[PDB]
Amino acid sequence: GTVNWSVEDIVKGINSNNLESQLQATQAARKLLSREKQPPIDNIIRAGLIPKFVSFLGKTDCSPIQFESAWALTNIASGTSEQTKAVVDGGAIPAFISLLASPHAHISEQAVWALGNIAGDGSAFRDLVIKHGAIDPLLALLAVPDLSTLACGYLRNLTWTLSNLCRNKNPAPPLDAVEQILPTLVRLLHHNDPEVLADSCWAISYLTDGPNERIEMVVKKGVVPQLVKLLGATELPIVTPALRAIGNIVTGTDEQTQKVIDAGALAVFPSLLTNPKTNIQKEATWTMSNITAGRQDQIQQVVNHGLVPFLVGVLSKADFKTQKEAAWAITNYTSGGTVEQIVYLVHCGIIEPLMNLLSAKDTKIIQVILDAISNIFQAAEKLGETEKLSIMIEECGGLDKIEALQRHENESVYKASLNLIEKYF
């Protein structure tokens, strides 16, 4: 009946003075815009149908056309920034916010979805959705004693849209909006559905991707233990955002990093640092690198959890980006660590892989490795064991690589290699 309509027929039906003909044409448009391959979004926009759909959003006496138009506009807004902008320019934001309070669950859900697409466009439309007052009705939809009484898809869409309201930077979401959303976000973070948990973790990862004040806003809500628990989850879609959020948090102050440590995060890193998913290994090694840049007691907790052998493993064999994060972790370790911690690092077998990595082409990893080696040599000097370290480096073939770096294009690598050779070789 409403399958495979032409845009011309849809326009003829929508321009009729007959609400039922308009409803059927709007459903035909929804089905066109809901097809798998290249839905004709631009054709629908050029036909000038967005204002009519927006007007239909307000037909309280005809809920079917409200639903069909909300679906069509959702799918239009799911496209490029220009198509989302076309939806916004038609006045859709306040109409969808008004529909949030609809007595029909599917219409309210579709409005949630549409606002999620609009806000997901970027910071500007995110803040514009916020300015139109979406947060209060959105959160009211979740003001129930037990989230389990809500439909699974409804709750998933609400969580996803809220996560989009927490998303993007330059600027980050308004502080007042974040404070208004965070309690519901914690409650969702304690939900049992895997997709709700994944999207709540993504929202938290967005909110912790910023200055230490945002990280503090998040951590003061007491979510770090739940984040660590989810870090231990089996579902990769949950582990990925949980690990992102934990890394973000440990980029903050040493006290926030210590909050991460106290929750038991380090105990998960034996698996994370050996995870078969390359992205997980890279993110876990980056988190470790930011943890080793902390206090000597935090470096010591890293030691106690037996994670130095795992860092040596990652440095010995892993994707090059993970190996670079591991080199950064080693350099931070050596910069902030005690002489005892540095000699332990050496006893775990760091020198051979660290030297093998000096054959890479990237300059920055070379500089990082040279700085780490300088710090290790300084610790050895303090112990008066510089000759043993020099012999170790010379045996693994590292002295040859250092001499070959003396003729490098970068001035920093040049000078660092020459200084090492002049001081210790």
């Binding site: 809901s34 097809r35 798998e36 839905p39 679906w71 959702t74 799918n75 807004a77 799911s78 496209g79 989302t84 579709q110 979805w113 999620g116 697409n117 997901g120 466009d121 996803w160 989009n164 998303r167 993504w202």
Partner: peptide, 7 residues
């Protein structure tokens, strides 16, 4: 997952 189309 910035945007999603409803199929």
């Amino acid at each position: 997952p910035t945007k999603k189309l409803r199929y």
